[PDB]
Design an enzyme around this catalytic site. Structure first.
Site, PDB file in Angstrom:
ATOM      1  CG  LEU A 110      25.187  -6.186  33.585  1.00  0.00           C
ATOM      2  CD1 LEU A 110      24.362  -7.167  31.290  1.00  0.00           C
ATOM      3  CD2 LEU A 110      26.660  -7.056  32.434  1.00  0.00           C
ATOM      4  N   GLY A 143       4.355   5.055  23.841  1.00  0.00           N
ATOM      5  CA  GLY A 143       5.583   5.572  24.508  1.00  0.00           C
ATOM      6  C   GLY A 143       5.455   6.899  25.076  1.00  0.00           C
ATOM      7  N   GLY A 155       3.783   1.230  24.067  1.00  0.00           N
ATOM      8  CA  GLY A 155       2.990   1.571  22.336  1.00  0.00           C
ATOM      9  C   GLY A 155       3.189   0.628  22.271  1.00  0.00           C
ATOM     10  CD  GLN A 156       0.627   0.673  16.733  1.00  0.00           C
ATOM     11  OE1 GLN A 156       0.947   0.208  16.047  1.00  0.00           O
ATOM     12  NE2 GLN A 156       0.626   1.186  16.639  1.00  0.00           N
ATOM     13  CD  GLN A 194       5.508  -2.805  17.340  1.00  0.00           C
ATOM     14  OE1 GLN A 194       4.429  -2.925  16.617  1.00  0.00           O
ATOM     15  NE2 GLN A 194       6.246  -2.420  17.567  1.00  0.00           N
ATOM     16  CD  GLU A 242      30.772  -3.250  38.136  1.00  0.00           C
ATOM     17  OE1 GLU A 242      30.629  -4.982  38.156  1.00  0.00           O
ATOM     18  OE2 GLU A 242      31.497  -2.867  36.491  1.00  0.00           O
ATOM     19  CB  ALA A 283      -1.064   7.111  22.284  1.00  0.00           C
ATOM     20  CB  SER A 298       6.680   4.521  20.001  1.00  0.00           C
ATOM     21  OG  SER A 298       5.902   4.523  20.370  1.00  0.00           O
TER      22      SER A 298
HETATM   23  N1  LIG Z   1      10.881  -0.948  16.852  1.00  0.00           N
HETATM   24  C1  LIG Z   1      10.572  -0.945  16.555  1.00  0.00           C
HETATM   25  N2  LIG Z   1       9.698   0.397  15.747  1.00  0.00           N
HETATM   26  C2  LIG Z   1       8.965   0.340  15.159  1.00  0.00           C
HETATM   27  C3  LIG Z   1       8.290  -0.492  14.761  1.00  0.00           C
HETATM   28  N3  LIG Z   1       7.120  -0.143  13.416  1.00  0.00           N
HETATM   29  C4  LIG Z   1       6.432   1.146  13.903  1.00  0.00           C
HETATM   30  N4  LIG Z   1       8.198   1.435  14.511  1.00  0.00           N
HETATM   31  C5  LIG Z   1       7.985   3.016  15.162  1.00  0.00           C
HETATM   32  O1  LIG Z   1       7.466   3.358  15.920  1.00  0.00           O
HETATM   33  C6  LIG Z   1       7.171   4.665  16.036  1.00  0.00           C
HETATM   34  C7  LIG Z   1       5.488   4.693  16.591  1.00  0.00           C
HETATM   35  O2  LIG Z   1       4.846   4.885  17.772  1.00  0.00           O
HETATM   36  P1  LIG Z   1       3.693   3.382  18.330  1.00  0.00           P
HETATM   37  O3  LIG Z   1       3.521   2.421  16.937  1.00  0.00           O
HETATM   38  O4  LIG Z   1       4.692   2.400  19.097  1.00  0.00           O
HETATM   39  C8  LIG Z   1       2.600   3.482  18.654  1.00  0.00           C
HETATM   40  P2  LIG Z   1       1.999   4.248  19.935  1.00  0.00           P
HETATM   41  O5  LIG Z   1       1.600   2.338  20.268  1.00  0.00           O
HETATM   42  O6  LIG Z   1       2.876   4.464  20.738  1.00  0.00           O
HETATM   43  O7  LIG Z   1       0.791   5.542  19.872  1.00  0.00           O
HETATM   44  P3  LIG Z   1      -0.386   5.095  18.680  1.00  0.00           P
HETATM   45  O8  LIG Z   1      -0.328   4.652  18.319  1.00  0.00           O
HETATM   46  O9  LIG Z   1      -0.562   6.684  18.422  1.00  0.00           O
HETATM   47  O10 LIG Z   1      -1.544   5.337  19.356  1.00  0.00           O
HETATM   48  C9  LIG Z   1       7.409   4.882  15.221  1.00  0.00           C
HETATM   49  O11 LIG Z   1       8.584   5.726  15.041  1.00  0.00           O
HETATM   50  C10 LIG Z   1       7.650   3.563  13.947  1.00  0.00           C
HETATM   51  O12 LIG Z   1       8.915   3.837  13.008  1.00  0.00           O
HETATM   52  C11 LIG Z   1       9.204  -2.197  14.811  1.00  0.00           C
HETATM   53  O13 LIG Z   1       8.925  -3.036  14.219  1.00  0.00           O
HETATM   54  N5  LIG Z   1       9.953  -1.687  15.550  1.00  0.00           N
HETATM   55 MG   LIG Z   2       0.225   2.448  18.908  1.00  0.00          MG
END
Ligand SMILES: Nc1nc2c(ncn2[C@@H]2O[C@H](COP(=O)(O)CP(=O)(O)OP(=O)(O)O)[C@@H](O)[C@H]2O)c(=O)[nH]1
Ligand SMILES: [Mg+2]
Ligand SMILES: Nc1nc2c(ncn2[C@@H]2O[C@H](COP(=O)(O)CP(=O)(O)OP(=O)(O)O)[C@@H](O)[C@H]2O)c(=O)[nH]1
Ligand SMILES: O=C1CCc2cc(-c3ccc(C(F)(F)F)cc3)ccc2N1
Ligand SMILES: [Mg+2]
Lengths: 438, 429, 334
Positions: A252, A146, A10-11, A15, A254, A99, A140
């Site tokens: 870790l 994700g 996922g994004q 990140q 173990e 996604a 995600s």
């Molecule tokens: N841990 C983090 N979660 C984040 C961040 N920005 C957004 N999110 C969370 O991630 C979730 C969105 O998932 P994604 O951006 O990875 C989307 P993904 O690429 O998996 O699928 P699509 O964009 O729907 O095609 C959502 O619950 C957001 O609240 C961040 O910087 N860190």
């Molecule tokens: Mg995304």
């Protein structure tokens, strides 16, 4: 030494991992180019080094990581970034089609094409590399990518590797608010099946963590990056212990095996302490007691939970910076004497905890000030299960709505599977309760 | 890539779509050469994907010129950035719908196929896949409707795979130039709705009223309002195409928007919504945009937000937002009304932040949801048609149109069936 | 009013494919009980059971003829009365949609129909039609004379709102049984849908076979109509690994099945709006839904544990079907 590779899904996965990696580079002092103007990595390829990257070229360090995304968007950023120069294009891959948020469709549609490349790509690295003690997963729950990706990944990875450990740092939708409608469907559906395959699963309190961190920040806002920053730093601490022996270094995994009495409990909840905001870091010099005590308080807890409500079957401590076991003991007495943390009857013993020589790792440009020691703890509570349930209910409502079926069916996913997720959740809750009870 | 073809058709759309494309072109900031004036790579690539590069790195706009009468295109071409479009790209039937959805429909189609095929072939070639197509026309006016009816079926038909959204102005219920005029629209739209996955419509009257009122101008100009509309569209394209800190794919969002693909369409909403003086002078605070959106005024179409219900509301913020801004905005919505929020689904609203703030104001938002009242109102209009039916005026012309009465009846009928769900929408929170 | 819509469940003998599957029969059919029990496991192992009691219940053992006799013969009399009747087969292919259609059922039916009518001695005419619903489009099987798609459009005939008229399809009447067969053979070929990887054959399209009988006796004139509907089923695309087009088509229907489950839950709801028009099938069906038409459903299920979803899905369905109130009326006309 051992090398680890991180996977970003996922994004979010990319990140977050991105934060991880750069931190690693910085901590090594390896330049983002990948070949540090600094001398070669510590101890040559240190265990930390190798995991982070390998020195090849020779005289270049290339990180061990794989970045995957259905959507071209986030990965392209990487290409843009300087770090990109460090990362040879093999490592970084992008996917044409996002996604967009379907766990099943993203999983099915995207996964099939992607997997072969990724598996190969990972494979080659895996072959070349000595191996990982384990690998980290990023993704995600909310993100379709994700969701779909992970599901595909989990089975394949599980089947192939078998022995190799798997850890997933996942984002758990804050009960406060989902991102999408889809997210509850995605999360529950994705999570349950995959989790079983996975040794353990991690979820994040977006709300709790964000609130806590932000409040710790005493900042109107944390940056998403900053939020990630916290995540990275803690992880780095984790790596540091295994990578470099601390006062006490333990396997870790173990230790983890010790930590989780049951495979049934995939993971204990883990905390990092002291809860350090930038301000929090500023405010006090942590003491063993202070950190522990701070850790205990739910404020420390990234997840919002009543630690009281859950029992502590056992907790782990990580130590960073200088530490002396005496202090630890002092903390121990404090903790032990303190009623508030409840110990499960099952485990009479707090033990064990480990200490790290090196002061806690920090994420670069770390918002928070350094703390003398960093600690992480694992606890198992019913309450943690409850949080899952909390999300579950909304999903359940969705199921009740039976809305967001034909998208899934287009993916041919059933209701039954979802029901299975729910029933498994209920399962699981029951199990969690059962274990939870002392 | 994933370019979408832009279509302007109907005289309305002859303006309006043209306006959209042109404004978008303006958004491109690509010089009239079709080269990219804009320094910005980011825009350049995104635009560039959108617009095939002619030699000289000209940008070939994705659009077709449809003329109710050939002059209309001529005006367009004579209008600015004629150059940017290669004349080859567009062709238009002289005949046009003629004011008649059916009459235009039948007549147009023969022309339509020829034009469509060539462009479509090119376009199909152009990008590996198009996200979908956008149509601009006025259903209410005879041609938008007339052309649309014929075009939509085949065009949609060609790729079931492709997801298309259509834009048409709906006739203002307040007044119509002629009773017949909406009549042409109604059949078109009715047929259209099932045909097209997504329709975006704003009532002319409300837009005019809002635009005018906000403008405090003597009247809203057709062009200006179109410009406003195009602006609304542009943000969506721009944001989605453009990187965003949070970007949502169309396929998600779209699927998400319907509590499942059964729900045919959602009605557009624009943000920030402000008066002409108000918006222009005023700068949005973070909460500011939301509030405007929330109020009835925000909706381009006139609806009482209570009267309507929102299946979901989605806004796309453009530029970064603070996470607590995220929190504040989200929080408000739930708080504001129980009914307003869908009971069933928490987080009804979705938002994405455009990676880059829009040209002009840093923050932009879009509104998503349906207006119960508006849909119901429209159905009433059909009833007006029904009353007209009692008149049975221009049955013959319709006969010439060749459409059967039954289609009329059914067209209303289906609508009637749907409309009562529309109320249901409001009924549900 | 009307008799409640009649629902019977049939559990197939373990399919040979099932055997290759090494599918295990969770399913237990107690025909005396008319109970069918499924090892759900629940969360638990499928010690856990889910037990339903059915209007009629047939284990694998149940012979085909018997089924027919029990279900068809009573329907045939309703047709002769002027009833409009419909029988829909749902279930798994292994369960024997195919087992049921390969053999009768159709070839047997036309023979009996004439026999009963002529013994009745009523002056009668028999007209048949066969269409397939593929990816939400109508295609004429019955008349190869007619196109692969019969010219298919449907409108309301004002007599029944639910009551509809399918313009352009022709049933050709023949007094004799024989003529019908000749059509019958022809029709079948048109009817056939795509085969599947999983199953040698699958029904890509829902098949609707309709026999209309005009009867006159000294004067009372009655018209009887029987619709024999064979479900089209999809498999998970992902499981199939089918070509994208194949997956897509399957997905469409599959999704449609959810839609079908949605309408059904509405019928249970007695909710204000019944989404008949969202499918051509349910629109055509529409007047039958608890309607005047006398309707029977044959749900087929696989003992195999393997397909949880279908078993669950069937079970849910069977409950839903009862809820809708079927008002078969004999459509006897004088
Ligand atoms: N841990 C983090 N979660 C984040 C961040 N920005 C957004 N999110 C969370 O991630 C979730 C969105 O998932 P994604 O951006 O990875 C989307 P993904 O690429 O998996 O699928 P699509 O964009 O729907 O095609 C959502 O619950 C957001 O609240 C961040 O910087 N860190
Ligand atoms: Mg995304
Ligand atoms: N908001 C706007 N509405 C317009 C504009 N021009 C026309 N209209 C409305 O659109 C309707 C007329 O449709 P068109 O302009 O598309 C006429 P068209 O080419 O489609 O067909 P003919 O009647 O054959 O000329 C009618 O309801 C007008 O009030 C405009 O520039 N802006
Ligand atoms: O391959 C197959 C077998 C048939 C089936 C039936 C259903 C169903 C049937 C009935 C209901 C309801 F009416 F009970 F709601 C709901 C779903 C859903 C999916 C499938 N897929
Ligand atoms: Mg015109």
């Amino acid at each position: 030494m051992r090398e680890c590779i991180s996977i970003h899904v996922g994004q979010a996965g990319v990140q977050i991992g991105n934060a991880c990696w750069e931190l690693y580079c910085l901590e090594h002092g390896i330049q983002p180019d990948g070949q540090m103007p600094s001398d070669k990595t510590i101890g040559g390829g240190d265990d930390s080094f190798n995991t982070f990257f390998s020195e090849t070229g020779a005289g270049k360090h290339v990180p061990r990581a794989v970045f995957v995304d259905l959507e071209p968007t986030v990965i392209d950023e990487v290409r843009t970034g300087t770090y990109r120069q460090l990362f040879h294009p093999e490592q970084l891959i992008t996917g044409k089609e996002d996604a967009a948020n379907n766990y099943a469709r993203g999983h099915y549609t995207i996964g099939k094409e992607i997997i072969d490349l990724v598996l190969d790509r990972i494979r080659k690295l895996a072959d070349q590399c000595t191996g990982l003690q384990g690998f980290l997963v990023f993704h995600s729950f909310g993100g379709g990518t994700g969701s779909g990706f992970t599901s595909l990944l989990m089975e394949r990875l599980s089947v192939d590797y078998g022995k190799k450990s798997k850890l997933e740092f996942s984002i758990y939708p804050a009960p406060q608010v989902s991102t999408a409608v889809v997210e509850p469907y995605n999360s529950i559906l994705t999570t349950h099946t995959t989790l079983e395959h996975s040794d353990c699963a991690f979820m994040v309190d977006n709300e709790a963590i964000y609130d806590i961190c932000r409040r710790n920040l005493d900042i109107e806002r944390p940056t998403y990056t900053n939020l990630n920053r916290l995540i990275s730093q803690i992880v780095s601490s984790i790596t540091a212990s295994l990578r470099f022996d601390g006062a006490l270094n333990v396997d870790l995994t173990e230790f983890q095996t010790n930590l989780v009495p049951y495979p049934r409990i995939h993971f204990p909840l883990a905390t990092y302490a002291p809860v350090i905001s930038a301000e929090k870091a500023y405010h006090e010099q942590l003491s063993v007691a202070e950190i522990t005590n701070a850790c205990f308080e739910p404020a420390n807890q990234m997840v919002k939970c009543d630690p009281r409500h859950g029992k502590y079957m056992a907790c782990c401590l990580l130590y960073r910076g200088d530490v002396v076991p005496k202090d630890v003991n002092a903390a121990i007495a404090t903790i032990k004497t303190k009623r508030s943390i409840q110990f499960v009857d099952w485990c009479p013993t707090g033990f064990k905890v480990g200490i790290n020589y090196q002061p806690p790792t920090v994420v670069p440009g770390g918002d928070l000030a350094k703390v003398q020691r960093a600690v992480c703890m694992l606890s198992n509570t019913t309450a943690i299960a409850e949080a899952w349930a909390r999300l579950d209910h909304k999903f359940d409502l969705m199921y009740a709505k039976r809305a967001f079926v034909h998208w899934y069916v287009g993916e041919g996913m059933e209701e039954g599977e979802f029901s299975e997720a729910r029933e498994d959740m209920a399962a699981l809750e029951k199990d969690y309760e059962e274990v939870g009870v002392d | 890539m994933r370019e979408i073809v832009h279509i302007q058709a109907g005289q309305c759309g002859n303006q309006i779509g043209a306006k959209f494309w042109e404004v978008i072109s303006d958004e491109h900031g690509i010089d009239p050469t079709g080269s990219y004036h804009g320094d910005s790579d980011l825009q350049l690539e995104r635009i560039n994907v959108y617009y095939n590069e002619a030699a000289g790195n000209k940008y070939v706009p994705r659009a077709i010129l449809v003329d109710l009468e050939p002059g209309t295109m001529d005006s367009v071409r004579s209008g600015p950035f004629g150059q940017i479009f290669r004349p080859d790209n567009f062709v238009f039937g002289q005949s046009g719908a003629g004011n008649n959805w059916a009459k235009g429909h039948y007549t147009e189609g023969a022309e339509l196929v020829d034009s469509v095929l060539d462009v479509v072939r090119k376009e199909s070639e152009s990008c590996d896949c198009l996200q979908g197509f956008q149509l601009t026309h006025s259903l209410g006016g005879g041609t938008g409707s007339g052309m649309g009816t014929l075009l939509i079926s085949k065009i949609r038909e060609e790729y079931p795979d492709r997801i298309m959204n259509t834009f048409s102005v709906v006739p203002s219920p307040k007044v119509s130039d002629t009773v017949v005029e909406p009549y042409n629209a109604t059949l078109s739209v009715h047929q259209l709705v099932e045909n097209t996955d997504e329709t975006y419509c704003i009532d002319n009257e409300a837009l005019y009223d809002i635009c005018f009122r906000t403008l405090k101008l003597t009247t809203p100009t057709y062009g200006d309002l179109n410009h406003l509309v195009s602006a609304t569209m542009s943000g969506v394209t721009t944001c989605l195409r453009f990187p965003g800190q949070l970007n949502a794919d169309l396929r998600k969002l779209a699927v998400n928007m319907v509590p499942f693909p059964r729900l045919h369409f959602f009605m557009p909403g624009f943000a920030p919504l402000t008066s002409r003086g108000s918006q222009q002078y005023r700068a949005l605070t973070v909460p500011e945009l939301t509030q405007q959106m929330f109020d009835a005024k925000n909706m381009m179409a006139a609806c009482d937000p209570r009267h309507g219900r929102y299946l979901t509301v989605a806004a796309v913020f453009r530029g970064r937002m603070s996470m607590k801004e995220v929190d504040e905005q989200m929080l408000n919505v739930q708080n504001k009304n129980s009914s307003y929020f869908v009971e069933w689904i928490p987080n009804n609203v979705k938002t994405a932040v455009c990676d880059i703030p829009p040209r002009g104001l840093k923050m932009s938002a879009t509104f998503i949801g349906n207006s119960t009242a508006i849909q119901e109102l429209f159905k009433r209009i059909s009833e007006q048609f029904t009353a007209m039916f009692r008149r049975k005026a221009f049955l013959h012309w319709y006969t010439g149109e060749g459409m059967d009465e039954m289609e009329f009846t059914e067209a209303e009928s289906n609508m009637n069936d749907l409309v009562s769900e529309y109320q249901q929408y409001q009924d549900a929170t | 009013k009307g008799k409640n819509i009649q629902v019977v469940v049939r559990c197939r003998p373990f399919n040979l494919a099932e055997r290759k599957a090494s599918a295990h029969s969770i399913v237990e059919c107690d025909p005396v009980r008319k109970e069918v029990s499924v090892r759900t496991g629940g969360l638990a192992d499928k010690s856990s059971r889910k037990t339903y009691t059915f209007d009629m219940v047939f284990g694998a053992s149940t012979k085909q003829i018997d089924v027919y006799r029990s279900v068809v013969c009573p329907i045939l009399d309703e047709v002769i009365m002027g009833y409009n009747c419909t029988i829909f087969a749902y279930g798994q292919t292994g369960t024997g949609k195919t087992f049921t259609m390969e053999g009768g059922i159709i070839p047997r039916t036309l023979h009996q129909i004439f026999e009963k009518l002529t013994d009745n001695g009523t002056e009668f005419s028999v007209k048949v039609s066969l269409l397939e619903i593929y990816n939400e489009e109508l295609f004429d099987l019955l008349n190869p004379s007619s196109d692969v798609s019969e010219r298919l459009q449907m409108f309301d005939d004002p007599r029944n709102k639910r009551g509809v008229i399918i313009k352009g399809l022709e049933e050709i009447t023949v007094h004799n049984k024989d003529e019908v067969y000749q059509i019958l053979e022809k029709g079948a070929a048109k009817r056939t849908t795509a085969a599947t990887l999983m199953n040698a054959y699958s029904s890509r399209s829902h098949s609707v076979f309709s026999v209309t009988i005009h009867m006159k006796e000294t004067e009372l004139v009655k018209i009887g109509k029987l619709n024999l509907v064979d479900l089209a089923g999809s498999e998970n695309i992902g499981r199939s690994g089918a070509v994208d087009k194949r997956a897509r088509e399957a997905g469409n229907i599959n999704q449609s099945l959810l839609t079908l489950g949605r309408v059904i839950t509405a019928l249970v709801e007695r909710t204000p709006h019944v989404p008949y028009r969202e499918s051509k099938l349910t629109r055509i069906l529409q007047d039958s839904l608890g309607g005047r038409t006398r309707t029977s459903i044959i749900a087929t299920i696989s003992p195999a544990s393997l397909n949880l979803e279908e078993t669950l899905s069937t079970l849910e369905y069977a409950h839903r079907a009862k809820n809708i109130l079927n008002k078969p009326e004999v459509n006897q006309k004088l």
